[PDB]
Design a protein around this ligand. Structure first.
Ligand SMILES: C/C(=N\O)c1cccc(C(C)(C)NC(=O)Nc2ccc(Br)cc2)c1
Ligand SMILES: C/C(=N\O)c1cccc(C(C)(C)NC(=O)Nc2ccc(Br)cc2)c1
Ligand SMILES: C/C(=N\O)c1cccc(C(C)(C)NC(=O)Nc2ccc(Br)cc2)c1
Ligand SMILES: C/C(=N\O)c1cccc(C(C)(C)NC(=O)Nc2ccc(Br)cc2)c1
Ligand SMILES: O=c1[nH]cnc2c1ncn2[C@@H]1O[C@H](COP(=O)(O)O)[C@@H](O)[C@H]1O
Ligand SMILES: O=c1[nH]cnc2c1ncn2[C@@H]1O[C@H](COP(=O)(O)O)[C@@H](O)[C@H]1O
Ligand SMILES: O=c1[nH]cnc2c1ncn2[C@@H]1O[C@H](COP(=O)(O)O)[C@@H](O)[C@H]1O
Ligand SMILES: O=c1[nH]cnc2c1ncn2[C@@H]1O[C@H](COP(=O)(O)O)[C@@H](O)[C@H]1O
Lengths: 348, 351, 349, 354
């Protein structure tokens, strides 16, 4: 009866539940290191990865990304020959880093070969439920065939799942079940773990095997990134904040005089039609080139590490302290009792 | 004698939107999982869904469509004894379909049950505002005495003491939910309730000890809430709202707010009481038209299969016994719905 | 010491919307329950409702209507002494009806009270912002010393210590509520309050020990809040907002965007007061028609409340009802949701 | 159990509270509001007759605000978004208007000493060493550098939200510590940088540290109503600093624009794009507008009125009593809802509400 009595024990935290407490600082925002190492083959100058979705990352996005010091993951919602071409395309553009997503399917190894042939630096085996036997067995197969290949497996939300995938041979683990802006998983399936807690629990375990974790989803301001990083993540992955960018796939859609870009979940009827969906379709404001959005994110990270007296991303993960707050805390934490006049480059 | 007074405020209650089901090790796919449940020795559903015995939800056409999706429908009692019998008769003739009927706690109650059973009703539901009553308990005994083979679903209850009381009265199944209803105002007019997830849980806890199943009834807005109700301990769930905008439900379509809509109302609302015949405990409204019951039920189950997939649950018994929740704040709720993106299309299972 | 410093944030407060009443075994139906209540040997009420002693809620006509429904009106003090004395007189010579009058702590308090006792007032209500004031305590004492029989309702307090203090000065009834009122801005303008549910309970905890009934005053937006207040230990509740749109309330009906409305305002707002800054605002509520249709919906909900708790009477309810606590999500589930509302119900707007 | 894993497993332990979370608990009172004392001592040479400082923002304080505040018994901080000689002129302008107290902000920069020199020459009564992060090595280094050169100068340093941080500035020479990272109405620090401590707790944790040394603290940011000020003082602050409640009064800088029939003034953060441009950047504030409130004397009379009310509610005769004794009760979001006007359509403006 022990499981029957534990159903409602666990409590979970999300980004907007917390604040990073300022700490003794000696280091200024321009001075801090934002470098990060996923592995031997995989080093990033900025801890950003653009999501593997048909409205977020194709060749042009992955390249603009890699030249910012970050990383692109080509979505798998295309042919095999096509993804391999675009992966090779990013590689011929200055010999820089590139990712490709593969689903746990029958044609998975066929896709992976063609991808390793095009010289991917990391494949991402993405699935709804990374804590699954099929997902384990696949990572085992792939680890067997390509012992040299960076393997990103997700998604997971628990310690148990983080361990299952590490042991199967995945060297980077991906955290997030249901925090995405376009995600309906928690609504339609009732399943999830608040992202902060899920980064924190998966990192605690992953820390032991010296394995890094990517916070995926739920990030809507630069300060969310800081929180996710400080809660244990090595790197964050973004969808919505990148979808509005000129280099992202999909052509600009006009709306109320303004310019927008389509942004849909890979699990939406829209993405799949090209069945019970776990995602929706919509649009985000046109934002400009990747370059200014990148600027605002990193600068936020830079100011947070400054506040936290963290010289590198390591010191931040291992030293940053949070403070929990109520919903009224959240109200104070955003602008309040003033009517906004101008748009800020980092706020709505 | 101070114990009762010092304890007025010790209990805490959780609901659907306070929690999330935690993903567990899975070796099963949504399609591989089984959603069948056994409610008793004569009542078995292929999907854990029951359409509410309300006058804007279930009549003969609703029950027939329900039974065909693998579920069940409860024919409401806002009609004549005779007419309700015909409706049960009608459902029965269309392929040996299952069907339930609602009966109130009155003096006409035995007379009404006599007809529904001669009509071959597969279960009766004694629905009341306060299922923890002598009036209810004595009526459940009275029926169980007369009809010892009859599937009795009794309610509504929100407590373990109450669930135990109706089981020892002879109830096969216990219906859980005081005040959780979408059209319901009980908690506002009378102050009384238990948050649904906790009510299902405390009750499932008692019903288990005796081998009795509970029915989660009310407060389900999306399919994820169904998984939560089942995972909390309910064998089966009862939906009003999610079903009222279906083609097979009674009533006609009307255009409102620029599209098609159906009338949805509470049985304790001023409207519904006029037809049937105290201070009202429900309101009258309308919900969007959704077309055939089939497409709705396909999303319902589809979400259920997805959840159980995430929970490594090959069947509903596993999900009841094993699923773990994690409590979350209001901010957790916001992360759990689509956010910070403008939606351009009604998704089949969202808004 | 350093005790006061470290305990600044220890306490926790709950309000009507924090909580639900748990359904209990019930032998009884709504129509069979008793809603009578006894404030004191002199004052007994057929229904647990007093109307607020404000200049836009209760004058003679309200007080008379209340009494006739089995409740009680408090005639506010925003008039002259001769005006309030004849207001009482009118209510009394209108069938031998119970009536109450407001008095504040000040110089001519005794003269007004003198005039009120002469006119046969049943209960004097010592309305002040801070019942736990030294000046309030001194005044309750003087009135008790002069009128050993007279019912004294003294308010307002939010703490067990204040309640204890009023009871010892001679108060027969204590009125509980700092800040929860619909028209009130005390909490906002002065940072000061206690959540009404915790307040009623805390004071009831102290008052029960001396057998003194408390009034849960302000904060009631629906029928169930009243069930909650009584179940938290109040003997009776006092309403202003729920009663302000009633036909027998002072104030003529005003037209605004076509719909009938009535003026409703705090007694500490600018208009009512005409040295200190306002602690109230001035507003408007829809017309509701006769008091009786409003009372019937109120008692109706109370009765359904009592039937769900298995309470034959209000003493059972006070001593036995159990609450359960919930988050914001639970309150969202507690109100009707995910449905367009078509028409108004007579008890939910 | 190790040294390495201490910080890791304390990450989520702390709890923060803010104004909207709590309520002051009424206590026995023998004192009427008009009898209480709102006088407050920040240091031997800096006594305020009312507990209110006009924040040092370009949309808030300049000579006219500073003058008007002082004549009410408060203080104004001339902002630094202007030249050195200009800022000293503003100071002299206030000092040559009846020897009114004035303070003036200075950041941590090479010219800081040049500026400080110029302000002291103008008889400034306090320098506010104002920075985004009070707990920075530079800020401590500056306080020390200034204290050394000006042993009698009043040095108000900010901004911090922790006892650890508050101890550093005190040990470095600040007479008065300013509290608040993120609570500001025009602030986005918490959104863009993720960082902050809820202001009520922040005021409390710092006051706890500071009172051991006999040092006052300033609640800076987050006050929307007079009641919030009272919570802030009762949480341990000697005095509050206000932006948005002062931003839209006659004496504040800015023209009177009008939209939809009503009067407004611009109010922007100092970390906003607008404020920076005056002297790509990654802002930590936003620009907007607030209602025109009219002459300062009205906002101030309402403010001090709320305070006296709450002190009477708390049986406080002076602010020291309130700091030492005031108790809070914690509430939820249904309580905050009950704590505002509800279920009535408000038909006119209370001078102190909305
Ligand atoms: C990213 C994502 N979910 O998080 C996604 C992507 C495409 C399709 C889908 C669909 C087909 C809608 N959902 C699933 O495949 N859900 C699912 C759920 C549980 C298990 Br086990 C296996 C799959 C989901
Ligand atoms: C509450 C409810 N369903 O949950 C319902 C349904 C129809 C009519 C009613 C009416 C008759 C308006 N209300 C009640 O019967 N309320 C009620 C409440 C407690 C007790 Br005991 C007996 C009756 C209620
Ligand atoms: C809050 C309230 N009734 O509940 C009320 C009523 C009338 C006037 C007032 C006024 C005079 C505006 N406020 C106060 O008198 N506040 C107050 C505060 C503390 C003390 Br001690 C004495 C009075 C308040
Ligand atoms: C936050 C604030 N005042 O409270 C303010 C004002 C002006 C400029 C700024 C800018 C330049 C945008 N931000 C910073 O200076 N941020 C910052 C953050 C951390 C550290 Br360490 C040093 C500086 C901030
Ligand atoms: O349709 C889907 N359903 C659920 N999750 C999705 C879907 N499509 C993408 N995601 C996840 O959502 C992430 C982006 O979340 P966002 O940055 O919060 O917009 C992606 O990286 C995926 O992990
Ligand atoms: O008017 C009434 N008052 C309170 N609850 C009601 C009333 N009518 C029906 N219900 C309950 O609400 C359930 C439907 O809830 P829904 O699925 O949220 O629409 C029904 O199955 C009944 O249990
Ligand atoms: O203006 C005032 N400021 C604060 N509270 C008031 C004021 N005037 C009346 N009250 C209280 O508010 C109660 C009515 O609150 P309501 O029933 O929620 O409308 C009255 O009975 C008084 O106790
Ligand atoms: O640009 C900004 N970003 C963050 N905080 C600011 C900024 N400008 C001023 N502040 C702070 O916010 C306070 C004013 O907050 P308010 O009274 O809530 O408007 C000031 O006294 C500063 O401490």
């Amino acid at each position: 009866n022990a499981m029957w009595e534990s159903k409602f024990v666990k409590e979970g935290l999300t980004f907007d539940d917390v604040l990073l407490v300022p700490a003794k600082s000696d280091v200024l925002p321009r001075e801090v290191s934002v470098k990060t190492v996923l592995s031997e083959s995989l080093q990033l100058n900025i801890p950003l990865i653009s999501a593997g979705m048909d409205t977020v990352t194709e060749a042009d996005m992955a390249i603009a990304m890699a030249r910012q010091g970050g990383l692109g993951i080509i979505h798998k919602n295309m042919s095999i020959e096509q993804q391999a071409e675009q992966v090779d395309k990013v590689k011929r553009s200055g010999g820089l880093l590139v990712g490709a997503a593969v689903g746990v399917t029958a044609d998975a190894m066929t896709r992976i070969d063609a991808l390793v042939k095009a010289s991917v630096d990391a494949i991402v085996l993405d699935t709804a439920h990374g804590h699954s036997q099929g997902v384990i067995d696949k990572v085992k197969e792939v680890r067997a065939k390509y012992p040299s290949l960076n393997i990103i497996a997700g998604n997971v939300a628990t310690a148990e799942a983080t361990k299952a995938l590490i042991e199967a041979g995945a060297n980077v683990v991906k955290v997030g079940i249901g925090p995405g802006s376009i995600c309906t998983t928690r609504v339609v399936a009732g399943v999830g773990v608040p992202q902060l807690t899920a980064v924190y629990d998966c990192a605690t375990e992953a820390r032991k095997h010296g394995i890094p974790v990517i916070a995926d989803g739920g990030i809507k301001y630069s300060g969310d990134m800081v929180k996710a990083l400080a809660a244990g993540a090595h790197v964050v992955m973004l969808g919505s904040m990148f979808a509005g960018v000129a280099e992202s796939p999909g052509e600009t859609e006009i709306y109320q005089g303004r310019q927008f870009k389509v942004y849909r979940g890979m699990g939406s009827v829209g993405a799949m039609e090209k069945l019970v969906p776990e995602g929706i379709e919509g649009r985000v404001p046109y934002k400009g080139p990747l370059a200014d959005t990148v600027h605002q994110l990193v600068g936020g990270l830079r100011a947070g590490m400054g506040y936290c007296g963290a010289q590198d991303l390591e010191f931040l993960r291992e030293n940053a302290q949070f403070i929990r707050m109520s919903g009224a805390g959240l109200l104070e934490s955003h602008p309040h009792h003033v009517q906004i006049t101008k748009e800020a480059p980092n706020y709505s």
